[PDB]
Amino acid sequence: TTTLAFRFNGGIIVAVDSRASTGQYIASQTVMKVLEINDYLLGTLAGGAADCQYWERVLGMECRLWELRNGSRITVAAASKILANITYAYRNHGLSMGTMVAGWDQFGPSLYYVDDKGSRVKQDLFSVGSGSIYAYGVLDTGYRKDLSVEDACDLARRSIFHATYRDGASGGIVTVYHVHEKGWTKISRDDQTKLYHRYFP
Amino acid sequence: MAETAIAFRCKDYVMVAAAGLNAFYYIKITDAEDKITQLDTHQLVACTGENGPRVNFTEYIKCNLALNRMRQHGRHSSCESTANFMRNCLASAIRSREGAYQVNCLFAGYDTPVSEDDDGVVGPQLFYMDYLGTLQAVPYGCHGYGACFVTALLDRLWRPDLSQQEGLELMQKCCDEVKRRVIISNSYFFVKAVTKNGVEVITAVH
Amino acid sequence: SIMAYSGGSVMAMAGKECFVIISDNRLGEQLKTISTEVPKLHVVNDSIVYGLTGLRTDQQTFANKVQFRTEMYKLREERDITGKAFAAMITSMLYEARFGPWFVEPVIGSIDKSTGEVYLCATDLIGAPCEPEDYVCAGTAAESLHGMCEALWRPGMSPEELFEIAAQAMLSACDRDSLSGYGAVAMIVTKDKVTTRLIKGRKD
Amino acid sequence: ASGGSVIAIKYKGGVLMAADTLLSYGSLAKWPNIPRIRLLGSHSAVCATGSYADFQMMAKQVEDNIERQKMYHNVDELSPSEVFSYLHRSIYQKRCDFDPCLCQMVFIGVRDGETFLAGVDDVGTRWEDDCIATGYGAYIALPLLRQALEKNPDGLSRGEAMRILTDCLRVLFYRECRAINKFQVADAASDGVRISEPFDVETHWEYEGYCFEKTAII
Amino acid sequence: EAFYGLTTFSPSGKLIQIEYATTAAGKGTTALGVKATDGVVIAAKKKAPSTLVDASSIQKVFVLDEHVGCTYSGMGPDCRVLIDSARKNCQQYKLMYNEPIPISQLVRKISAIYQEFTQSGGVRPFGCSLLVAGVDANGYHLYQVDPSGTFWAWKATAIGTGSPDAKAFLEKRYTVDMELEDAVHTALLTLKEGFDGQMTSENTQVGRVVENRFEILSVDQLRDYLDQI
Amino acid sequence: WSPYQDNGGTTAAIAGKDFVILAGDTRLNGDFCLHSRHDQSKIFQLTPYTYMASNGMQADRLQLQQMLKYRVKWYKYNNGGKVPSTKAIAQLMSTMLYHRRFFPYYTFNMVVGLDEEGHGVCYSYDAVGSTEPFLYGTRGSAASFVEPLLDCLINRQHMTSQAPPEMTKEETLAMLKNAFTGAAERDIYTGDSVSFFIITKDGVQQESFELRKD
Amino acid sequence: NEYDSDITTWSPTGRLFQIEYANEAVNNGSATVGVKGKNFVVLAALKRSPVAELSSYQEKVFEIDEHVGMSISGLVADGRVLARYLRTECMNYRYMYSNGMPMNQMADMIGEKHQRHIQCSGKRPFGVGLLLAGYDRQGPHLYQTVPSGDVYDYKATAMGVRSQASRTYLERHFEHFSDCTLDELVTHALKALASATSEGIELNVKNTTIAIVGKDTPFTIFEEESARKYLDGFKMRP
Amino acid sequence: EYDRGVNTFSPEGRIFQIEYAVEAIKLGSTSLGIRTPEGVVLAAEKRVPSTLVVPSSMSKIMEVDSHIAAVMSGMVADARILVEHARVESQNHRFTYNEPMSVESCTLATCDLSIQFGESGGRRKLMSRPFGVSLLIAGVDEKGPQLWQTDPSGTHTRYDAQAIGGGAEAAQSVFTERYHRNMTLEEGETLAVDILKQVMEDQLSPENIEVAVVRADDGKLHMYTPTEIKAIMSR
Amino acid sequence: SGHDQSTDVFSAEGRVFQVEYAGKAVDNSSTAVAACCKDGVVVAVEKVHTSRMLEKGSNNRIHAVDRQAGICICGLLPDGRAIVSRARQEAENSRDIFATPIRGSVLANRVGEFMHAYTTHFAYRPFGCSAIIASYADDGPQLFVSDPSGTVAGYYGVALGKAKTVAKSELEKLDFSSLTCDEAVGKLASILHEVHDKQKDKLYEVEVAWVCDKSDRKFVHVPADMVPAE
């Protein structure tokens, strides 16, 4: 898993791989590592496959019940605090999950990050997973706040690829999203092997 | 312990400084994260530790000081009453189900007379704490890896009659020693100060 | 160990119509000095003075429960607590938590205001009552204090010359212990007065 | 106290089940005169390999269940397939309580033509076959029971299924340490379950290669 | 399980259930006590319903510990709950302070048992009063609780039937410097003037708390006192 | 004593355009012996359109098949007789594997059924419920033999050739026999006889097949 | 009448009125007729007719297991609390024994469920009657519980409002129920159910629920579509 | 009054507190529901106490999910806790079954709460009284548009056209005519606002009532605005 | 007044009416009889069927408690099934804990304490039932009757029900010392057909059950062809 996401002038772009390996055996190659929480939030997945898919389905239930009672959308500062209070409550139960929430509330963008130990941090630039250390060096070299929409989609798709190429626990099909003010759109969905003969023809 | 907190009190101010480093086992997540939580208008705490228990301990302390100002008609409690409420939460957590808070903190504050009948403390307050529940009022306290570099630095250079600028150039020497010997990259230090007019965020020393 | 985590040694001697009690001034975390001006003594009335050693988190929590119970004893019973009743009270407190035990070792010294009999008591961390008529001592330098106190004590001492023996016993034992030292704070107490003395020591 | 290997087989018309009458304690054979074949109700019987105290409390429980359902209400007696099902769910309940019934069991039962033969483990495994063996009879006696069911797929008669159990009990006496030569055979038919008087098998120890001078290590 | 209260307020503003219980606590036999400079005497009156009721078996002066005693006048079986809770609360004091209890603190504890049942759900108040007396580290004491929970600090008093005319006889006979032997002389004498027949050693029961100890007097030591008054 | 034990066997399924083929060998075995050769307790029917096909530990298999059996019955009673779909059952499976996360089942599951559209989809699970819809799936001891084999002949990858037409029920069945005759040769805990289930919209037909007995 | 307020109060004549008052709830519910044959039990419930076009639907007949089913009359809110208990105790049986629960055991289990609610002070009886339609190894069974805690084993019965006339019809044909086939056994149940209706209404597929359990037949509720084969040709002849 | 109990039957077979709670529905605002093969319309008067009330605060129509609406009558303080329970149940169904809860099973999840009342707690803490609110749940599912009513008896009943509240007896006579089973949704719009005009005492304005629909081809709940309610009046 | 509304209220003369009102529920119930026949005990009761369509075997008031004992109830049928399901639990305890069959005088003393414990508390009402314990344990043949007050007593014969006074005089003509279980089924059933009238009910049949040495000390019902016809 090499999930990353960054925040810039124009919204938030989320970019993942799609590989689930139980050690040296690859279990699957079409894993959706972005659970869309609703039509203006996103959540990402790293670590345990069942620990992420359970509690972000619990998180998608607490966000839907917010809109039923209060009649309005949930913020992202409330959405991660739901996920961080759940996570800190089970910190001695051996959970393994590292998740980013990204969305457009009424205060603009916000890109948070929740551990499996109850941490919650607020930056504009993350890269999580076992192969994330490869995705920093190509992203920190080319990141700037005022990127265009097409170049930041190119920087995200290219920064996943150089970590899927080097880490054994990362790879598959690079999925790029874009969180603008009206919600999120699936930008592209392409194989890593097809993406090698584009970047090095 | 990878991140240091440095605090010393003087005649009419208390300096605090806490490195804003947040890491994932060797990877720098941030460099500017505020770790000095403003509890009251004249009180703050500089907690160190990992980011899990550190927010959840400070939010429990801060929301209970505010609740004790709701139920008591906006009357601000003393700095010793806040500090003794804090170590009650450390000491009752080392003998509980969920486990001990892994937070090391330095409480700081200034005591003002709330009315004309108050004849309590007028001066500044600075309290050393621990993750177990140790509490000690101390002239200067330090946590982290670089604590022992700078506690013996303040053995050399701290004076009780330091001014606002003389203690400002002392804290600059405190921040430059941690950059010199500690292998952990602490580059931005978040210097704040507590005076008779409240808290203030010092921009110069970083 | 958890008992020698914070450092600090408290002892007490018994005299003719007086007793002494004396602690050091060090607080620490296994090698490093946290504070240099912290006593371990506590005074509840004009007859009983007790000292706690062990883990400093338990030295403050237990002393809050004692002050919660000593002041509640004075509201229910319209009288000051006596030495035999105070020592048997916090003997019971260390036995209720026998499987989750406190890491304190209280050194109780007391005297009768009207009679003039001294009463020493030093329990263990699990509440083992023990009343010697000569001296008690606990802390990290406790093995060094049983040699200093036993070779220098005699039963018939004046209050001025009992202080001189207890002070030379604390300092000579803290010059061999690397978890206790930095001066000493003593308190001689008779039927008529309480005198609190701070003693010069090595700053090592 | 611990029991030894238990073997069982179906024939044309009923089910047979044999077990030694020994109850060892480690290596010590304490009592050679206790019966291990308990029969359940009026159509079925169970026998165990493993701890005897676990079997003695379990079979006390499932015998009380057959009678009290039949005595109190105007219902039929439980079939062998339904009291084995209660026997299976009671052992699985004990391992989830971290206090299992530490023994393998062999269950037989015949109710008006429908023959039933199944076994159950301490964990909760259950299986049905035409030949069940537990203990070290699953290693020794069970290969001999399997070839004699496939050398005639029409089925074994009672006479030829009794020859091969005696051929299997004889090798269990040769090759299992914690065994004696005293065996009881249950016989569940359409008449009901019938436990026989204890017998023994004829053992041959007279090979010319077993003599003192051949097997000597000089 | 009937968790509602049985004792409530009246439109006059009075707890009418406790007013009925004080009538029940004044229909017992005459129990009394006097103090002195050297001790405190308590005196009872064992009323035998017949000659066949084993006067050496029934008792009304209850000893609570090595320094406290008691005597009731009211409902007998209601008193035994109070004495068994007072003997229990006095042993819990010695397992916690290594000291005899004061007479003040024991009477505060049993007054919290009267008031507990006047504000509980489904119970009625007690129908008996007591006469607690004993020593502690600050002299001699004689208290007297009520079924309301209201306790007093008397100096010479009496409870039961024939009590208001025996308490007036205690006003006329008390002196501030009465000795202990003078106290027993007048505690038995104020039983006689309201007594029906002729009091014997198996007919009354006294206990005089002396110097650390309560010590209910035996049938031989009380026979010494009857032929002296 | 250890409360976990692997009982061998394997299950494989290949889903088509309006059908699923579901298979699993009938072989129970313990510590070092062979308990049975005719255990039908490896593939369980929940609804007429959706099966579960699990393996691993035989004792926790039968417990999971019953708790799945009655949550379908409380679904049928509370919804007016409406039978649950494959997507509803397989999310029920994915939650109950996580409710017992700290004392879990030693089972490895496959929920196999048809869609609301009629297409067949197989799911797979770890010991704690990681689900994914996919066109095939192979669990058990011989999973590492067959799951790379199903990658090479269903996906049609790394072969510079045009795509074959859609697989029928017969060409899928004859393909899946080549895996179990391949797992009976090289896996010691697999193979006495494999039972094929063919789930179509007009009921289910059931076949058997013979493997090597050693 | 000061002996009718509480459930735990006997009359001075020895009657329990709160139990006798709950028995009037069953006599005010909709009429249902159970008829037992040789291998089949047929329940015929009378659900509510539409108000001139609009069709209100309310579920009375319940499936308990593959071999059990019941039809209620009275407080339908207590008829579903019984449906929660009966369905749970038939799942707990088939979990343990892997077979269907016998009807003589089950009729004795409903009667102790009615009995816990008729002796404590802060509890009330279930104001609802039942008609168990069961099949087991001993053949078909037809029971009927009342709010007193009784359970009666019938050959044929009828409970509901004006079900005395349906019971009068069944007391002339109950000797000829072990001889009829299934198609005649439905016909005796529907002729009985039609004599409890109003003065100007007859039966059709819009107001009748027919439930059949048998020997090779699980408990099947014949509603609107499949019920037409017994209800299109039907006339209540005098 | 406490001479009787809360579980005391009548000699006619009725429970006292349940029969006394049905009469509390007739002393409330009226509400409607019309099942049509394009959707279900839920009309309801608001019955404001004064003109100083903002009308967006006393919504008689509450959403349970995207596909289930609920309109009440009677006292609305008890109505909230039933809808706050139906929202929790219908989201636990999507959490467990990955599919929307059927309209029948959301009515059953409410009726299970509307029966749990007694006087002796013991093991469980019970309610002291039945709920004085009759809900009226509508929605669409795999079986299409369905209408349901929860009464304070605990009795759920599927309907085609049902009116609850004060103006309910007069509406059933209007329900007999003016309703065929294959109406359009817009014909179901103008049926409800003509009934709700007749059975109310005040002047029917767009800021006086509430109308919400759940369409079949859309599958989602669509509540109306006062500019949308006026367009139904001028037809 | 309010002195007969619950069980925890003694009267002005020391009586409890809700117990005595429960005794009128047995006196208005069907007729019960029993007999001890020096090798066993025979118990017969009359089932008053209220409809012609009741199945034969419905509303059997005789239930087997243990293999050797069984309780027939007289009074309310559903109230007596709480007594039967309790005395079964008392007999299962002696088999599972003490490894012995429950004695006849001990099973009856456990019934009389379960029926008495609901006559001392305000929240409970007494049973409308008289339980007849017929046992054959290692203390011989036993015949006990527990009334709603909780009073147990060993009898040689007993009549309970409406016509318990006429059927008691019909038991005084039997012997109980030379009486056997072979003849007494024909005798006791002939008591019920003479003590009971058909001018109130049309449907009445008898249900007889014994436990004796001929039935191998087992509490069984009759074979249907041993009972007299009318």
Ligand SMILES: Cc1nc(C)c(C(=O)Nc2ccc(F)c(-c3nc4ncc(-c5ncccc5C)cn4n3)c2)o1
């Ligand atoms: C703000 C930030 N900065 C960084 C650099 C991170 C970060 O990395 N946070 C993080 C938190 C929790 C986790 F659980 C994980 C995580 N991701 C994984 N991906 C794959 C495997 C794995 N897969 C297959 C086989 C073996 C292994 C070990 C394991 N993990 N563990 C990662 O957060």
Ligand SMILES: *[B]([O])([O])[C]([C][C]([C])[C])[N]C(=O)[C]([C]C1=[C][C]=[C][C]=[C]1)[N]C(=O)C1=[C]N=[C][C]=N1
């Ligand atoms: B990513 O590589 O971490 C990815 C996580 C995503 C699916 C949520 N999957 C995995 O690599 C994990 C690795 C792992 C981490 C921690 C403990 C155990 C395993 N794999 C799985 O969780 C897994 C294993 N088997 C089947 C399905 N998923």
